[PDB]
Amino acid sequence: MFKAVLFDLDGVITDTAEYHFRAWKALAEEIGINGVDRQFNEQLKGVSREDSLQKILDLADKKVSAEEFKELAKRKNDNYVKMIQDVSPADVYPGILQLLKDLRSNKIKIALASASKNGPFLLERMNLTGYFDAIADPAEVAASKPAPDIFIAAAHAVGVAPSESIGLEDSQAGIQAIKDSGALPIGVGRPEDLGDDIVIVPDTSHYTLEFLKEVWLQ
Ligand SMILES: O=P(O)(O)OC[C@H]1O[C@@H](O)[C@H](O)[C@@H](O)[C@@H]1O
Numbered sequence: 001m002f003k004a005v006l007f008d009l010d011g012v013i014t015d016t017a018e019y020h021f022r023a024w025k026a027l028a029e030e031i032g033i034n035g036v037d038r039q040f041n042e043q044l045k046g047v048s049r050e051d052s053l054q055k056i057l058d059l060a061d062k063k064v065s066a067e068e069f070k071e072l073a074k075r076k077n078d079n080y081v082k083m084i085q086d087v088s089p090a091d092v093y094p095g096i097l098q099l100l101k102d103l104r105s106n107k108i109k110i111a112l113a114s115a116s117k118n119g120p121f122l123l124e125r126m127n128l129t130g131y132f133d134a135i136a137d138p139a140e141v142a143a144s145k146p147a148p149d150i151f152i153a154a155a156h157a158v159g160v161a162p163s164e165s166i167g168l169e170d171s172q173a174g175i176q177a178i179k180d181s182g183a184l185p186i187g188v189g190r191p192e193d194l195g196d197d198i199v200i201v202p203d204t205s206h207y208t209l210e211f212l213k214e215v216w217l218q
C-alpha cells in the first residue's frame, strides 16, 4: 500500500491557482503584454515565481534589465500576498480536510511538495499545518517543476520512497515532476489540459482515501 501522499498546494488544497493567475495577468498587462489568458496560464501553473515571469516576458519576446526583473517579481508577490490575507479554513477545497484526517488515522505520511514560498503562511491561514508531517522547502531544492526534485524531497522528508507515494497535482508541469520522481500521479482538472494518460478527477471531492486505494490497487 502507498505510504505517503505528496500534496501540491495551489489548485489542490485551495483555489489559490486562480489568485496566481489574476496577479500574473495584472503584472503582464502593466508592462504591456496581453497574452496571459486562461489557456496560456496552463503553462504557468506549477512553475516558480521567476520562471513564471520569464515565460511571460518570452511570450512577448521582451527583455528587461536585471533590476526591473527583480522589481517585477517582487511587485507581483506583494500583490499576491495582499490577495491571500483573508484566506481561512472555509476556503479549503472539498474533500481535502477529511482526506488529511483519514490519512493520519491510517498512518500514511503527509508532505507538502509546493513551489510556493507562501506555502507555510497559507497552511497556517487554513488551520492545516498540524496535518503535515513535512513541508519541503522550495528554496532548498536545486531545480523546480517540471523537474522532480521537490516531490523527491517531500518523500525523503517523511522517510518514504517516491515509488511508494501518490502525488496530487492540478498542473502540467507538476504532473511531469511527479512522473519523473517515481510517484503515482492523480491529477485534478480537465483531461484537455492535463492529458489522457494518467488518472484525472474533475474536482477534489474525488480525492478520498477510498479512491486513492482504488487507484493504487488498479
Ligand atoms: O510566488 P510563490 O508563492 O513562491 O509561488 C510559486 C508557484 O507556486 C506554484 O504552486 C503555483 O502553481 C505557481 O503558479 C506559482 O508561480
Ligand code: ALF
Binding pocket: 008, 009, 010, 011, 017, 045, 046, 047, 113, 114, 115, 116, 145, 171, 174
Ligand atoms: F500549485 Al503548486 F507547488 F502549490 F505548483
Ligand SMILES: [Mg+2]
Binding pocket: 008, 009, 010, 011, 012, 017, 045, 046, 169, 170, 171, 174
Ligand atoms: Mg497547483
Ligand SMILES: [Mg+2]
Binding pocket: 129, 130, 132
Ligand atoms: Mg506541526
